[PDB]
Amino acid sequence: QEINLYSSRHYNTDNELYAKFTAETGIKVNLIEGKADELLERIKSEGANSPADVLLTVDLARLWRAEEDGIFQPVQSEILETNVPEYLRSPDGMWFGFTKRARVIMYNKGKVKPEELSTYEELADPKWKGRVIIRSSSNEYNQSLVASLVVADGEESTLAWAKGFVSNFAREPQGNDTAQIEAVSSGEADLTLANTYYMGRLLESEDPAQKAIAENVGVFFPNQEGRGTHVNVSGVGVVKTAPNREGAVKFIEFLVSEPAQAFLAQNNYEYPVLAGVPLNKSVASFGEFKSDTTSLDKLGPALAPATKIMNEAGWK
Ligand SMILES: [Fe+3]
Numbered sequence: 001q002e003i004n005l006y007s008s009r010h011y012n013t014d015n016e017l018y019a020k021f022t023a024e025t026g027i028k029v030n031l032i033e034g035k036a037d038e039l040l041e042r043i044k045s046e047g048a049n050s051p052a053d054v055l056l057t058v059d060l061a062r063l064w065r066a067e068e069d070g071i072f073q074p075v076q077s078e079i080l081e082t083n084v085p086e087y088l089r090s091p092d093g094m095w096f097g098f099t100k101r102a103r104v105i106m107y108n109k110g111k112v113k114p115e116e117l118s119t120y121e122e123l124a125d126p127k128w129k130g131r132v133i134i135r136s137s138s139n140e141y142n143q144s145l146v147a148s149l150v151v152a153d154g155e156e157s158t159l160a161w162a163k164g165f166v167s168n169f170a171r172e173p174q175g176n177d178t179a180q181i182e183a184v185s186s187g188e189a190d191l192t193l194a195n196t197y198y199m200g201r202l203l204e205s206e207d208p209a210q211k212a213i214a215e216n217v218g219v220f221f222p223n224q225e226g227r228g229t230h231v232n233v234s235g236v237g238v239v240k241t242a243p244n245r246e247g248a249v250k251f252i253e254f255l256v257s258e259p260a261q262a263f264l265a266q267n268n269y270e271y272p273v274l275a276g277v278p279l280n281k282s283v284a285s286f287g288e289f290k291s292d293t294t295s296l297d298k299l300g301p302a303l304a305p306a307t308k309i310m311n312e313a314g315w316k
Helices: 014-025 036-049 060-068 078-083 140-153 155-167 177-185 196-204 208-215 245-255 258-267 296-312
Strands: 002-007 028-033 054-057 096-108 191-195 217-220 231-238
Touching (some): 002 036, 014 028, 014 245, 036 060, 054 060, 054 245, 060 140, 078 245, 096 245, 140 191, 140 296, 177 191, 177 208, 191 196, 196 208, 196 217, 208 217
Antiparallel strands (some): 096 231
8 A cells, every 4th residue: 555645845854744654554655745836737747647646735725726727536534524624624625734834924033023013014114124035926835925915905905015025125035934034033134924833943943053043033923903814734635536545535634633733733833723732832932823714715816916916016
C-alpha cells in the first residue's frame, strides 16, 4: 500500500508528519513537492492516469481553483465531518482544511506601539511611508489576503489601498515571511505581514539567533473591530483519478485526528482545526483574537481581481 502525495507544504516537520502516518497505517508515502500552481498544472497535464492520490496546499483559495477544475473526488468520512468544522471543508466533500494560520502584522517593538495599529487597510496610511516590507505578490498567502480585502471592501477600494500600501514599501519585495520578520527585527523596516506560525518557529527555535530576532518583533491581530483577522488554512483533497483512494482517505483522516493535530500545533506552530487540542505555548502567548470566518467561501472567486489589483498597484 502506498499513496502519491503532491504537496505545497514546505516545512522541515513534514517528513516526520508523513512518517507518523506510515508508522500508524503501514502506508508508504511517495512525495512530490512544489508550489501549489505547479502541482495543479502537473496533475492536469498528467491525465487520467496521473499517480497523484492526494493534493495538499497551504492556501484555501488554491483548493477552490482545484475543485473548480474538477480535480477532486468526493469523500464522505465520519471522522472528517466531526473533526473538521463545516465552514472549513467543501460542502461536497472535495477538500478539507486541517490547520489554520493567521496572516498578521508583525512590528518592531522599539519603533511601534500596538496602539498605533488597527487594520490591514490602515497599512496604506501615509504614516507608514518607507516603513513597510512584505514578500512578493506572487506568493499565495498575499494573494489570498488581497482577495479577502476585495471581498470585504470591494475592488475599487482595494486597488486604492494596494497603491498606498506599495507606496509605503521600504524595499522591493524580497525573501519569504521569515526574511521579512528578520528585516523588521534588524531595523530595515518597522512592520510587515506574515503567518503566525513563522513567529512561533522563531520563538521555539533551538538557535539562539532566531530567538533573538523574535524578541525584537511583536504580533498584532488586525481588524478586531470588524470582520476579524485574515485566517487561511493548509488543506487537502483526494485526486479524482487517485490510484489508491483507500489510502488517500486514510491519509486525510490521519491529518485531522488528535495525534497529527497535536503534532502540527506543537511542532509546526499552526492552529489545529480539531477542538480540544492545545496550541504551542509560544503561539498561545500571542493572545486570543477574532478570526474572519465570513470571507472564506468567496476568496477563490476574488483571486482574479486580487492579482489584477496587485499588478496594477506595482506590487512586485
Ligand atoms: Fe508557509
